[model samples]
Target: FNILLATDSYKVTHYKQYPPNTSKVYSYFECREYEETVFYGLQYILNKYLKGKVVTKEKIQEAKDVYKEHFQDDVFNEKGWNYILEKYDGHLPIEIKAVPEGFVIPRGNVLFTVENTDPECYWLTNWIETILVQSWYPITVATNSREQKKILAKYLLETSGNLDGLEYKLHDFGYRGVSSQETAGIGASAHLVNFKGTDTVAGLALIKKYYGTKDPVPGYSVPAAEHSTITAWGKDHEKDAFEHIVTQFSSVPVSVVSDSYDIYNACEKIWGEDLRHLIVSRSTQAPLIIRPDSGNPLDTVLKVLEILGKKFPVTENSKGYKLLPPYLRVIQGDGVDINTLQEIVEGMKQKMWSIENIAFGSGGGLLQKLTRDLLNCSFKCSYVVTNGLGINVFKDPVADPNKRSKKGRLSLHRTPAGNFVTLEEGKGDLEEYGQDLLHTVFKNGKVTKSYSFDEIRKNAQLNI
Candidate 1:
């Protein structure tokens, strides 16, 4: 991307460096010419100022090792630097105005601005772009995820008869399907804002690192002996099925893939008599669970449930199924997404099947289908500088006049009525305002503001 720097001062120093194999040396003295220089200048600032610090020498060494590992010899060496430096030289002496993270910014609203500083170090200010964009994406995902969760919750309450089951249905099965581990964690926290649970264990770790939540555990438990795979070409498979039933383990529940050769025949011939008695004999609370990995899941589940119901009728005054085990739950894993899930739920409703009778296992469709763009929340606002003066301005795509940004350092004021307004019309009195977005978190390469993951998680919840 081409870099655009905003600064008011005319005096600016620009530098250029090319790849090691190339001898082409690009030089520029004009503010517009040093865009690359400004880009690198901003990168330098991030390296120096925004890097995470360590309280101990060993930790510092670890940080250094990590930096070296990722950056390698090239480090900040790239063509983008040249573009950034030129922009910075042109917009010298500009002050940057930006909204704090976690704020609910409306569309067309100004989040932050960059303008000329009286004593221009145009190159120095160029560093903010890289850092700003990096920070913006996570916040955007978090915010959008919160909105999605609310919509989902509303949908569940309206469609499903049970509102009490809403929380359990909110699962974060998006890690393996997501673009990266980083996104997985951020997405989970965002989902948490709306009361969604996630099954992404790695994502949970990231959320704990950034937002401080407790570790997660597997949602369900299915025993090992009950797990079985299918192979279709065996003779006397029905007689072989009898081997699974024994007096000592009569109540032991096992899942057999009935679709090896012919699903219908196997269900009737092999699993019909032997497995039915074992299922019935199981403890009242625990039932044999069945898993179908192939075929049309909706149709298969319906047929299977019906067959089980007919053969294993409920006993008198028994809370569980008489012939079938009470703990019997159907798990569908092969192909499931939002549409498929909706379809399954709709089918169950039509068939009058209990919602708890089914459980879902998702893989590729949940995580792989979500792209970086789908999860992206971007910063559209930019800062401009010219002629030794700085003005904070916003680019409003929606063009709502009232939503335009305020110039200079901005503050958000909460009125007694619980509404917020930006204090832009008044003079340079910051203390008079209720809250300011740009607090001095870091000054002179040292952090002045320290926040724990717990604190940020709490903030995320409140903001959502």
Candidate 2:
């Protein structure tokens, strides 16, 4: 892909519009809201698009041709681009400093900063903002997943008294629900930073390809059945289909969708009564996960648990919450989001069921239904160097104080009280505020730092 065109159309003219003798431009990425933010996916972007000889003569000409006709004016900075090609051999002159991937910090603090390495290419900083800001996608997805995990953890702790198998609580079922394979890959990988269960295969491949994940795999999925796999057997043969599934996946945990004709009948008559023997036969080694694909999640899960409670033995935990046998569990895959997920957990507790009785699979809510504004993510110019004079800059719109941006070359500092704060105007002193959290990750068309998938997971793991 041509790196030159990977920016806003108007960015083509920004080189000529900068302050006279402008030598450097610095910008920082931040989410205005104070939601806990998971820093991730920048490595993937850098390795995929930014590293190496990203700029080229061919790309410059291509962008020049397109902008010439598109703008119908002499707006394309052909000279500036050629200067980069001849002087730097098409390597972009820029530096990016960021927190380690998967670092979880509260928002409203600077996540990363970008500045031009070459004074003549000062405009290059914001020109690349279009791609760099896409970090918001994975960051927001990771943050959302972590928040969901927190909710599940709260319920799990209250009912089960411990978070066993918490990593598998939320599964990614967002492949088809996303806009592109890349979207599913990015969003699902972000979710994996918080949870271990996922059905988005693209995400798995992405991690292996981009993050250099090795043996044992970073995420996993069970043998699961969707509607077509069940309904293809026809309604009359629903029990037969369930029989085939349980017998086939008897050696491992399996999930079967049961809501084609009657969710109640499928749960009570088929799973609870008829196939109860087969399910219990392999209970010690393999678990049959019944998936309710339709109806209100709270009612369906409650009823399903009630039916199964009678069919199989149930136990009470130390917290006096009802715990269904591990061999029998339910996964609610329909209409699941942050609110509904918590609602289901609360409903289970109201019915005296443990949070461990069910796991969740989110499709649109995990990947497709989110936006950059969910975290209010923004990239703004904070400092600039012109004619060898550095100046701190920011915007404070009187109309909306909330829309105001930060000032100075930014650095992140962790206070003695165990809080992260951004040091403005380049005032981050190691002795005064400890080591700066932000490190130079990229410079001059090369990645200067790397974090493996395992390392990233360690950085992102919650202390619940």
Candidate 3:
């Protein structure tokens, strides 16, 4: 992608539009809501799009031509483009300071700050806003995943009496549900900040490429089946499909979608009776996870569990919750959003069944069903320097008081009570508010801070 054109159309005309003698422009990104946020995905943005010498005469010319024809005018800032190329040798003269990726900070705090490092390139700060703001995508995904993790952790502890294999409970079936391979990768990496199970290979590859994992594959998946792999065997041979997956992944966790014709029959006659011997005879290490893809998730899952519990030996956890034997479990992949997941888990608890008796596969809900406004993510100018005089900038729209922006330079801090708050206007009294949590991650087209996948996972672990 051409760097010059990677912005809103109006931003191309902004270099000349800044106030007379404007020397610098500073901005900050934050989620305006009161919800806690998982600050993440900036490293991927930096490494993939912004780092190193990105500006070029060719790209500049490309933008100029496109804008000229598109806008039907000569509003392109050719001089500023050439100036940046000449002065910085194609490297963007901007700095970005942000809370380290994977840190969980409350919303309405400064997640990142950006500003022009060169007096002549003040417009470049917001010009890059179009791309930087897209960080909202991964940040939202991470927040959603972490929030779900919190729910899963709670129910797991209450129902299963342990948190074993918690990371693999929510699998990512979102690869095809997302918009593109890039979207899948970015969203997947964000989800990985909290969990290690995924069907999205692109996300694991992204972690290795951008997040720097020592292990070649940062996330893992079990041998699992979808409807096609089952239905293709014909309705009469459905048992053979389940048998095939169990036989192939005999010594490890394998999943098969079994609700093609009759979920109850599949769980009982087929898996409960016919293949019960084969599944039980295999190394107890491999558990057959039956996936129910339709019906009211809460009711459907409970029924499937009841059937499996009858076929497999039922064991009780110390918490007084019933668990199907190690060789059998159920997975509910359809309509498994954060809310529905909780509903299903709670339903299991009410029935005296352990949360360990089930895993969940979230496709659209995990990665695609979120929006930037979920956190009310915003990037706005808060400070500017013109004619060597600093000025605070903000927008307090009267129509909506909540839309008011912060003024002056911003800093993020944690209180003595362990709550997060944003200190605006002043550069922040670090002595009182504690050291600034924001770190200079990128400056003048260089990545100053790179986080590893393990480091991120450590920082993002649930506080509970």
Candidate 4:
């Protein structure tokens, strides 16, 4: 049966290739050829070969033609084409072991490791690094973002007692802050795994492509309340700003900016009794979220909330009033990243403010504060080919004790004490005792796991 299976696999994997050493000097040729070949090969494996079906020669020929047409100036010479053709010649079996995309890996932990099935096939893995790295960035970011969110969540829970509110304020709003469009999309998707929302509409599109649910909501408008900005050095921004915004988005909950001139004075001027009464009179019952953008955020929040409480005391009638009509109208948006959020929650606990009295909108700090280094996430090729052999094994080049990679395949072992230890250089047998870090996603020429974007997103959330 093993021999029969091997024979069947051989027939299914066979494909024609372009001549070796394609005489292509242009970078565009190299790029096009590389992309086409990789995409075609991956498609074949995911669509046909893994399913115990054969990839047609016609499909292979079409891919070759696509490569050639894109690089018309490049000639398929013997050396180049042979080298390329040999890559797909069933020499190296690619085995990828990765910590499931959303798993929160620790510092100095091994997130992924790839090994060649055959020593001769080791070189093939090098060609896969670019695409593999591109695919990995989002997952890595997602895992880290999720961990950060947990820290924020714990802080909030401790500071705010059963604050049955402000649930959706924590979001991944890093799209504008990301370096590129692609990164924005991927980062947004990853951030969504840990937090509940994102500003990248494009990420929502990608999420729908994979997961089926449109971001924000499937068909409904994205459910995001507004938290207006206040500058320390500005004019009567509160009144005009609140009026302008409320006029435009009347149905949505509006959080007014109340700290442009004076934090306390602005609140009194805008959210005082008459304005509060007017808000209650609105037909749609839109909630008002008041934000103080400057000053010591924690202290400012406390003072503002204390004053607001005097006017709109948390009474039974005010249970669901919007904008101080009855419901709490305290929301803050400023430099509220993970650390600040934690600090605010902790301070609030010390001072004892109602948790549901405030919501937070994090901007640059939350989205752009933690970098790859702080997250201890790095993309380095552990092994690179030299003289037709895997030779350059990677190690921590930095002097920092915490910035090291655990060498070899890894496993997450659950200890009796209920803590987890990451096992470096783990073997296949260990999987029976613990969760397997690497899963078989693609085999031969097919995707074994059929994951929707939503499923992947949800999976990231669950793992987080």
Writing each residue's lDDT as its tens digit, candidate 3 over 1-464 gives: 77888889999888877899999899999999527888888998888899877878788888889999989999998888798889888888999999987888887889999999988888999999999999999999999999999999999998865899899899898999999999999998888888888989998778887887777788888888888999999989999988887888888988888889999999899988998887787655677888889999999998888888777789888889897877777888999899999899888889999888889999999999988889999999999998899999999988999899999988888788988878888758546787888899999989998888888888999866
Off by over 4 Å in 2: 429-431
- For each candidate in the order shown, give its overall lDDT on alpha carbons: 0.43, 0.88, 0.88, 0.47
- Please say which candidate is ahead in TM-score: 1 or 3: 3
Superposed by TM-score, candidate 2 places the C-alpha of residue 435 at a distance from the truth, in angstroms, of 3.0
- What lDDT tens digits, residue by residue, belong to model 4 across residues 1-464? 11112222222222213123221100000010000001001221223222333323343455445446655632322232233335554322455544443343334444444444444333334434434434434544554455555655564455443323333656555556767775665556555555555556666665555444444442212333333333322364456555655566566666566665676975665666536654554543466667677888888887887677666644322223212343336666777766777788667656556455566666555545545334333444444434443333335646765444454434555555755455554353455546654455554333554444445444544221
Instruction: Rank candidates, lDDT, best first.
Output: 2, 3, 4, 1
Candidate 3 residue 231 C-alpha distance from true site, Å? 1.6
lDDT of 3: 0.88
Error of 2 at 200 (Å): 0.5
Q: Write the per-residue lDDT of candidate 1 for residues 1-464, one digit (tens) a residue.
A: 11222222121122122112321111111111000100101122223334333123343344345435554632332233333234343222234434333444433333443322332233344334444444443444454444443444444444444444344444455666677775565555444443444566564554444334343431223332222323332445633543443333445543344554565554554455655565555674455555566788789777876776666553321222122346454556657665677677667656656555555555555445544344232332223333534444443437655333334434445545765455552332556545654444333334344443334334444221
- Distance from true location, Cα of 174 in model 2, Å: 0.3
Encode model 2's per-residue lDDT on 1-464: one tens digit a residue.
Answer: 98888888989888888899999899999988526888999999999999888878789889889888999987988888898788888888899999999899887999999998888888889998999999999998998999999999999999987999899999999999999988989999999888889989888888888886656677888899988988899879999999998898989999998888888888789988898889877765478888888888788888888988887889999999988787888899999999899899999999999998899999998898888889999999999988889999999989999889999978899888998989888888446887889999999888999998888888988786
Give candidate 1's whole-model lDDT. Answer: 0.43
